[PDB]
Design a protein around this ligand. Structure first.
Ligand SMILES: Nc1nc2c(ncn2[C@@H]2O[C@H](COP(=O)(O)OP(=O)(O)OP(=O)(O)O)[C@@H](O)[C@H]2O)c(=O)[nH]1
Ligand code: NA
Ligand code: NA
Length: 422
């Protein structure tokens, strides 16, 4: 026993992403998410289901909690997707009042539910648990504020376990006017308490779906969130399936985090379709991952890579994975201090994602984060310098001085990334 992970889904976005993640995990392990059972003995593959799944005598269950301050997002999701016996009631921590898109309300109100969450965690977590994944959006109030609270709480309550965040940044035009406040407060909290923050934003995700998958229409968030689930599944694949070169959560974090503050990560995956997986080389897929068209954060260019983790899944030619490394280092811009021989961390897993021949997933610690974060900061300053929208932060325990303190720490992180850029 060991390597187990517990996933916390927080707020509307975090729980809706949870559906796609758990659907992917069950499919990869040939588990029927509706019966809780293996689909068959004959197609049961050699694997390690316990990373994300709890096997009980009756069947398999997610090692997850589904957390929100209002019940509708989760309840509607469970009904629509017929998840009632997988996203079961004993895994739900739901209130009634909502955070009303204010980080401070999510943080304060979430405090009331922390005892229940800790009891549920301590009720079912194996002692060998390797860490926690927190899935949330940063632009709303619950994912941002309650998710920040949970990041702080778990790091304090379970020292020695990893705390990783999968966090959705606001779109290029924000669809929550309060998002700059919520995003700065969240990123400040995660800089203090998270071990690694993997970032996404909907502008990039929509671009990928429309331009790489060519979906005719996006009618539900399930036709966006599958990309986040794919990253979460693929970067943990070598914990769950055989392969030549496996890596765990903190192994990946240690290879990425050059300085303690540089823990904000941009993910990408290639290819996006089965047809492309059958007509691509390892070199082509890695080049796609390092191209801004495939970044799941909206970026103006390639930036400068400080450090990267690449997971090769499936029908991978190991000699190609290694021989292209000089090409990667020559064709991709790395930060000035990165030695020509350094900056790459490899995992290789024999299991391809569903019906694909092969797939590459990239986690990049890239100086371009400074540009992404500077834009958030500019949005923040446009509100804060006018004292707009501050009242309900102040009324919920975040003073105007506190907002400024969070902004100034956020700026310090931006400047660290910019300094590494040269
Ligand atoms: N990618 C993605 N983004 C989402 C999803 N749901 C909401 N969002 C985005 O998340 C932000 C709003 O945050 P929500 O998750 O709705 O808010 P919340 O955490 O429930 O907080 P409150 O509603 O204020 O209590 C906006 O930027 C939305 O576009 C989702 O399922 N997937
Ligand atoms: Na909500
Ligand atoms: Na909402």
């Amino acid at each position: 026993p060991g390597r187990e992970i517990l996933v916390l889904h927080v707020g509307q976005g975090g729980n809706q992403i949870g559906y796609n993640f758990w659907k992917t995990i069950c499919e990869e392990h040939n588990i029927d998410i509706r019966s809780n059972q293996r689909k068959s003995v004959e197609e049961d593959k050699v694997d390690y289901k316990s990373v994300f799944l709890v096997e009980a005598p009756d069947g398999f269950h997610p090692r997850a909690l589904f957390i929100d301050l209002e019940p509708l997002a989760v309840e509607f999701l469970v009904k629509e997707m017929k998840l009632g016996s997988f996203f079961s009631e004993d895994l739900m921590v739901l209130s009634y009042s909502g955070a009303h898109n204010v980080w401070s309300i999510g943080y304060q109100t979430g405090k009331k539910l922390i005892p229940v969450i800790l009891e549920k965690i301590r009720d079912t977590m194996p002692e060998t648990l390797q860490g926690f994944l927190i899935i949330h959006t940063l632009g709303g109030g619950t994912g941002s504020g309650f998710g920040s609270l949970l990041t702080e709480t778990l790091k304090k309550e379970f020292p020695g376990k990893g705390v990783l965040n999968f966090s959705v940044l606001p779109s290029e035009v924000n669809d929550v006017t309060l998002a700059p406040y919520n995003t700065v407060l969240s990123l400040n909290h995660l800089s203090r308490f998270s071990d690694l923050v993997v970032l996404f934003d909907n502008t990039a995700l929509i671009r990928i779906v429309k331009d790489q998958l060519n979906y005719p229409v996006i009618k539900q968030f399930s036709d966006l969130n599958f990309l986040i689930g794919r990253v979460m599944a693929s970067i943990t694949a070598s914990l769950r399936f055989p392969g030549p070169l496996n890596m765990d959560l903190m192994e990946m974090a240690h290879n990425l985090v050059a300085l303690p503050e540089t823990k904000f990560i941009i993910p990408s995956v290639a290819p996006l379709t089965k047809e492309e997986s059958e007509m691509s080389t390892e070199l082509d897929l890695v080049e796609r991952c390092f191209d801004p068209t495939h970044y799941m954060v909206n970026c103006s260019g390639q930036g400068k890579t400080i450090s990267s983790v690449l997971m090769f899944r499936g029908n991978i030619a190991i000699e190609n994975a290694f021989s292209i490394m000089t090409d990667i280092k020559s064709n991709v811009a790395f930060a000035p201090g990165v030695h020509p021989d350094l900056g790459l961390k490899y995992g290789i897993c024999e299991s391809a994602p569903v019906d694909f021949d092969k797939e590459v997933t990239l986690l990049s610690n890239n100086t371009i984060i400074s540009e992404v974060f500077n834009r958030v900061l500019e949005r923040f300053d446009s509100l804060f310098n006018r004292d707009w929208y501050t009242s309900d932060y102040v009324n919920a325990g975040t003073s105007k001085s506190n907002l400024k303190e969070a902004r100034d720490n956020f700026d310090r992180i931006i400047k660290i990334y910019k300094e590494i850029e040269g």
